[PDB]
Design a protein around this ligand. Sequence first.
Ligand SMILES: [Ca+2]
Ligand SMILES: [Ca+2]
Ligand SMILES: [Ca+2]
Ligand SMILES: [Cl-]
Lengths: 241, 239, 239
Amino acid sequence: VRDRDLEVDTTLKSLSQQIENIRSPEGSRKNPARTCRDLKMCHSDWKSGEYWIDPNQGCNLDAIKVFCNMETGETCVYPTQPSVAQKNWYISKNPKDKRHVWFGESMTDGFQFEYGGQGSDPADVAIQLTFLRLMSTEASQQITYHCKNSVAYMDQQTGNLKKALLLQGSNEIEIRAEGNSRFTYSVTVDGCTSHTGAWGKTVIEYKTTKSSRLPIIDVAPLDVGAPDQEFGFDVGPVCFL
Amino acid sequence: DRDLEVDTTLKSLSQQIENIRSPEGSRKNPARTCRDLKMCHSDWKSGEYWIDPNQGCNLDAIKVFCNMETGETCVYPTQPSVAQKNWYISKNPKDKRHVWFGESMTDGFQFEYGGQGSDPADVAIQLTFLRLMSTEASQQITYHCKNSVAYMDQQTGNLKKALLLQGSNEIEIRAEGNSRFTYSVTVDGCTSHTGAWGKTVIEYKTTKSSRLPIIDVAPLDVGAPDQEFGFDVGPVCFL
Amino acid sequence: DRDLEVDTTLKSLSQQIENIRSPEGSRKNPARTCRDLKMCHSDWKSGEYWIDPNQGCNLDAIKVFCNMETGETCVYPTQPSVAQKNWYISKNPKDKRHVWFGESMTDGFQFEYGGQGSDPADVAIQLTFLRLMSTEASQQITYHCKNSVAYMDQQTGNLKKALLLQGSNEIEIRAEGNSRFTYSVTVDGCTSHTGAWGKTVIEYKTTKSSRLPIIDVAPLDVGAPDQEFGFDVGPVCFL
Ligand SMILES: [Ca+2]
Ligand SMILES: [Ca+2]
Ligand SMILES: [Ca+2]
Ligand SMILES: [Cl-]
């Protein structure tokens, strides 16, 4: 028989701690917070890093593992597969005709990008993203196009953007190099501007208040088709602030 | 003895906390959605539960059918059964005007959901939240007909006399045309005028869950005094 | 002995659990919306409460007026009162052009809400949630006018000089046109140039609540140095 007083005092501390964990979750997997923005706001001193969150609440078994930037409050959700190998992915029955073709939708062994990490169910994560968009004022994502004999953005020969690749946003919105300036991506470095027989890369960013457009789920290069034209991707996380 | 009052309180506090972390789906402790109940209690089975998708005060919680195989929350119409009779006499046998039951017929009404004496405005907020917490929705509706084509016309072999449906965000769902705004038909017993009762069963299923539930129906083959219809309106189910 | 200790701790735990299930709407224990407060505590009085519709951490709670007769949550502009003076001088008698106070006039600014020293980005997220939990929203604005038509022009009897409103959604709200996007007026003392102050009181009410609150105003009948105006901006109210 357990000593009664110590048992009661132990239950009391445990009940008190259970209530505290409801009020102030620590962002562990058993005890996930709502967003990184909430963690930051409520815990000024906590360090940037990995935390679990459950923005759609209810049952917490669908919580997602994310990086919180505690300087900015950003919640960053990683694609399930950050890295797409660098190789030839497509040969057209017509080398000379350069046209946009979707990696995920039309290329042998292509896939549309998924988010959350290898354990997750995408339908659950889609619900989580919906709540994250609701709890943020903007979102941003970066993607790197790795290139060998493949223009990504600016064509050095012509000086124009007509061979630039297309991105597919999350709600059937294309994001482009040109056009309406609220649907256009920006480019920080562009090492793909000519065919050199060597590898370069172009780094592309989209930031918007219309967070329904992110993340990116597909990429359509144009300057592809000939058999020595190779590319690959590093897909960054979609970050909500 | 006498102070196991304390053990009772401790057990009750512990249970109140558990009901918060993981609601049982009772009226007192409603869960958020059937999806959450299935997720948190994998051994629980299909049937009626109380949910509160919009949280806050729990007094506007709604009683639903949870399909615990799929995770669907199924929200019933307040009046599933609509009487079978002549609802409409036109100045005509121009039996080829769509006329809304709810917006236009005498004693017609647009369909409400939630059951009990739910307040429809509370329930609209709940449906708003169920849409956020699901990826698709579907709904079935039965058209009972007496001398009234529903979908296919045996005479002409075509759909030009098909009824149309109104969705929740005012979208019109039709027999033909764009694949996205199109309803399907499982059984079609309304194809000719025979003096007897028949029925036609219709489904719509979509990822644009704003379009559901159905709030109105506009038959076309109505107007003469010998033409009668009714409905069974199924639940709107969110997955 | 020290059952004083134990029963005091049991009470405190029972209370903290209560505060989570039924927040009181204080700054430390904010409720979700006024609607929820009314629903759960029908005896509570209209007044100032703190709410946190977006939940998570509660430090971004906003202070609101709850109308406990209606269930309305009213969120006040940070600066309800905009001074009455000449704000804009054109190269004019043209005319007769809409000029946005916020986007275009010197010293003009778009309207922020939440007050205290809230962060507009935080309040915008709260309004997103307020909109999800409400069926309807309204707001009233007063245009104080000296030699400036706001709505009806008495020399013409037309609304062609009526000011424009900018809603939160972008979305212009206008005197005329499609009826879902028009404002109404309950007072119009601006119909002629008298050299004295008058005012026009405008209201917009909609189920499409992402159009509210109003964030900017474009008068048309401005541009000369003798033309002056100011605003009293009402709360945006949600139900
Ligand atoms: Ca969850
Ligand atoms: Ca509720
Ligand atoms: Ca909050
Ligand atoms: Cl929520």
